[PDB]
Amino acid sequence: AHHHHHHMCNKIWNAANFVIENTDGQDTGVNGEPVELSSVDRWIISQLQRTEQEVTRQLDAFRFDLAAQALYEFIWDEYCAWYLELVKPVLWDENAPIERQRGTRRTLIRVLETALRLAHPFMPFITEEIWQRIKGQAGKEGPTLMLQPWPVADEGRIDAAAEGDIEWVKALMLGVRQIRGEMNISMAKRIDIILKNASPSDHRRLADNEPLLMKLAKLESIRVLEAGEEAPMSATALVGDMEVLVPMAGL
Numbered sequence: 001a002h003h004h005h006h007h008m009c010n011k012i013w014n015a016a017n018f019v020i021e022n023t024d025g026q027d028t029g030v031n032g033e034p035v036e037l038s039s040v041d042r043w044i045i046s047q048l049q050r051t052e053q054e055v056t057r058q059l060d061a062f063r064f065d066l067a068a069q070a071l072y073e074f075i076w077d078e079y080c081a082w083y084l085e086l087v088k089p090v091l092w093d094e095n096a097p098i099e100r101q102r103g104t105r106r107t108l109i110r111v112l113e114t115a116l117r118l119a120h121p122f123m124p125f126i127t128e129e130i131w132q133r134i135k136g137q138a139g140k141e142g143p144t145l146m147l148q149p150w151p152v153a154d155e156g157r158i159d160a161a162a163e164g165d166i167e168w169v170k171a172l173m174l175g176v177r178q179i180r181g182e183m184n185i186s187m188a189k190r191i192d193i194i195l196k197n198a199s200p201s202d203h204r205r206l207a208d209n210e211p212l213l214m215k216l217a218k219l220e221s222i223r224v225l226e227a228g229e230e231a232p233m234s235a236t237a238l239v240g241d242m243e244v245l246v247p248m249a250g251l
Contacts, residue, residue, distance in 0.1 A: 023137055176217045195223065
């Protein structure tokens with residue numbers, strides 16, 4: 001979607017408030033020591049690199065319009081729409097391992113800091129405002145955002161495997177949402193899922209992301225169909241060639 005500058009003010013302010021509320025008084029890994037990143041963290045970091053490249057390419061071609069829209073698609077459509085939801089199973093679980101907490105919070109704050117730096121040429125005052133409040137926790141120093149270094153993409157942090165995993169998680173989550181809307185099921189009700197025609201990558205992606213899926217898609221259970229199992233009558237969606245079944249039995 002095209003994103004207006006003024007709408008992005010609101011989006012950035014609210015994102016920053018969420019990040020601050022979820023990092024104040026907590027360890028953001030500002031010490032520079034090891035954290036534990038999941039493929040969700042690696043995905044958003046990889047997307048950030050690609051965005052740095054495209055914004056810079058467009059600025060180099062004097063296309064402020066295209067540079068802003070590439071940035072805004074990252075901030076609005078990836079970071080806000082998805083990453084800020086996908087971190088919730090860690091941020092809101094008191095028993096999340098401390099290294100995962102550190103990795104999640106570091107990632108949240110470093111990506112925000114970089115997004116602010118990239119947006120400064122378009123929206124200097126709001127970005128400066130927020131930056132001054134988060135720079136300490138992001139591990140950045142300097143008096144003003146305008147004279148900070150321009151970000152340079154690190155090809156070593158591009159991670160196509162993580163990206164493919166999170167695109168699968170998105171498609172599964174959207175497929176379940178779409179079934180809820182169609183069957184007028186509350187977004188709150190826990191439901192059972194069956195997966196039909198699941199490849200080995202599907203299985204690996206499920207094993208890796210099961211706890212997140214259960215929490216965020218509000219699932220009672222999720223399992224692959226047993227070899228030679230008949231599948232009960234259900235609403236369906238597709239994630240590639242895999243089909244996602246919600247048995248009607250329940251609702």
